[PDB]
Amino acid sequence: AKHLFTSESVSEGHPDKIADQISDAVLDAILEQDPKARVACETYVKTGMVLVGGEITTSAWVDIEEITRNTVREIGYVHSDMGFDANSCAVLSAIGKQSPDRADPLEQGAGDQGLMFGYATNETDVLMPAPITYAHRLVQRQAEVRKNGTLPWLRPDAKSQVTFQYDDGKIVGIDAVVLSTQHSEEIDQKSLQEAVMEEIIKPILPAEWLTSATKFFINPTGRFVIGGPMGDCGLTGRKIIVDTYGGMARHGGGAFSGKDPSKVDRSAAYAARYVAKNIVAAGLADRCEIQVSYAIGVAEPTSIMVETFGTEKVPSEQLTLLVREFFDLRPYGLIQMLDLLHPIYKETAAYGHFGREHFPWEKTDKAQLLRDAAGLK
Amino acid sequence: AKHLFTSESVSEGHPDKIADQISDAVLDAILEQDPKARVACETYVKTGMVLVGGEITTSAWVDIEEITRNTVREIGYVHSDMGFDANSCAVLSAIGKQSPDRADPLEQGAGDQGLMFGYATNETDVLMPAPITYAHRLVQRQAEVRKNGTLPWLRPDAKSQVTFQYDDGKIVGIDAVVLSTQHSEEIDQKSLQEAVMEEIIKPILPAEWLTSATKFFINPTGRFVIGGPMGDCGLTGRKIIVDTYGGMARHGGGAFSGKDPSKVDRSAAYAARYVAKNIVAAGLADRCEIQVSYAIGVAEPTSIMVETFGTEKVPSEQLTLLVREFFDLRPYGLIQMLDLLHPIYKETAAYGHFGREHFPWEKTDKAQLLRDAAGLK
Ligand SMILES: [K+]
Ligand SMILES: [K+]
Ligand SMILES: [K+]
Ligand SMILES: [Mg+2]
Ligand SMILES: [Mg+2]
Ligand SMILES: [Mg+2]
Ligand SMILES: [Mg+2]
């Protein structure tokens, strides 16, 4: 029975995502000199300005001014007529720095409470939901084509929003595609509409899914000329859903950018993606969602629950059992089970933290061992 | 079959929530002089300072400096030894202002795309999930007792986190309670732990739910003396989940504070709470979650889906049908179906947007008419 579901994405250079990227760019830069640095760096971008403010506990010395402008230039906001320019804009900092000064490290208790949810579903090749997958690929392509000379009238900022019609649990096809891209004065809308059809939408949306019925809305308002942080206002942690699973799965509140991995808000969440993906790469279920939660100063999580929503090939009991044998979910264990203390984090900050395979939380190494330990098939 | 679930809350005066409140306090103040004002005001708070920055399109003139300090004082951060003082802290603004200058207004198309999810469940008296309900009531009580002289050693900032054990769909009871409150130098932890037990936890958590087994963690780290924005960093839109359903239900990305009601991110979301609550106040199901989505410049929503997760008392079809007859979900219709253009919004900004009955989205007026129109019982 049919039903339909939607998910959005934005590009690098939508103002919130500018903030996520600059945040994670500081965290990377600090982690490069000091992997054990504890960092929380939040950022606010508005037409003139980038305020990067945080607390950081490190020996590292880094230049927040140049880190900022280099991230703004890579996105490509480089001239006033764009909205915002990486070379003349103001960058202010309010980052306060501290220098660091149980018997088994893994048993160190969790620094801040909370809840994290992870998901995987066999709906795609990457085990992510198809919506959020396609939304990302659309915005991603957009930047590819901007960035690679094909369609050099494109400017950085853009949103995509795919809406899928299922019938139960099978993707049936694509009811609507929204895609709105910022562009120059060169081009008018009919002309933009052929290009975004040819070069962005057509090569990404799978064809059997596209129909005579697919409502497509390329630049519905027309004329998007400006432009990122001019007249809008971006801050880290705002694209929480796009960062995860486009709202196919749940979420406890937490943002990721600018959090170094001691922060469970990030790690528990990466790890939950990792547990659920391995669970389904092993055929124990088809869709799995895990909630983990932690309490301040306790190190074993206060809760684990699994929802395989009717898709099991072993009982939930056996499954919750397996979750605990194969995965060290103590805060410091996460960091080890996934080897986090590395500058891997900027590339996360646009296009989605999950479904992208080459990050340590997307690897399915535990798949087999996991099949075995209750009910090898 | 048992399983357990967790949700957190924070008080007024946790730094993010400080931001939400100041934002909504500007929006209220502007709406009081100009109900049709279009406002998006985002805020950032860090030890010295409050930066309130936005775009606003209004005739109204309001004093952002005094709006800020009055909100900071009501929360109660009033002296340096607290962390932060409403009377000496800096307030900066970067709010850019514009003055305003189809045939049927209701048919005006939606300003920005996206997705919104609303939920209700019969688990409580207010039709909200019990977790997020109790988390809120805990933090809420905390401020009540701070604010009312009972426990005047309390300071503003605090987090609660209830974890519930169900067995399927029935709340069985409460496995753990975390509660951490900022406090003065007066009091030591054993003493704080009796008071927070007597006066905060005991009078709020329902007793049959509390057991010999309930793990309680009052100030687990001990000594929380300071203090809100000192050394942490708050910005609007960060407590997205606590604002909604503590992660029992889904969420498309969007924050609410500082958004005037033309913003679907807020309105579509209030309305979805309203549709789902009426659906269950009428006994058509037990738990309902609605997704609505909108596309830029279209006015009928691009999608509606309903999940009554096996709890129906009429088919989903009949239900999706009823959703469309009883509720005007066009952006401008929402505003009318709920009468939004009123300064009601600051009180929303701490303790949760939903489950609080006296807001127009919590009222169950459509309940009956809704029962009838397919399958009066
Ligand atoms: K952050
Ligand atoms: K958020
Ligand atoms: K906002
Ligand atoms: Mg947190
Ligand atoms: Mg925004
Ligand atoms: Mg939006
Ligand atoms: Mg925070």
Curated annotation (Swiss-Prot), chains A, B:
Superkingdom of the organism of origin: Bacteria
Q: List the disulfide bonds.
A: none
A GO molecular function term, named singly, is: potassium ion binding
Q: Which HAMAP family match?
A: S_AdoMet_synth1 (MF_00086)
Name of the gene? metK
Full protein name:
S-adenosylmethionine synthase
The Swiss-Prot or TrEMBL record lists the needed cofactor(s) as:
Mg(2+); Mn(2+); Co(2+); K(+)
Please name the pathway: Amino-acid biosynthesis; S-adenosyl-L-methionine biosynthesis; S-adenosyl-L-methionine from L-methionine: step 1/1
Q: What is the effect of changing D232N?
A: Decrease in AdoMet synthesis
What PANTHER family does UniProt report for this protein, alphabetically? Answer: S-ADENOSYLMETHIONINE SYNTHETASE (PTHR11964)
Q: Outline what the protein does.
A: Catalyzes the formation of S-adenosylmethionine (AdoMet) from methionine and ATP. The overall synthetic reaction is composed of two sequential steps, AdoMet formation and the subsequent tripolyphosphate hydrolysis which occurs prior to release of AdoMet from the enzyme. Is essential for growth.
Describe the subunit structure: Homotetramer; dimer of dimers. The active sites are at the interface between subunits; each dimer has two active sites. (Microbial infection) Interacts with enterobacteria phage T3 S-Adenosylmethionine lyase; this interaction induces the polymerization of METK into filaments that are enzymatically inactive.
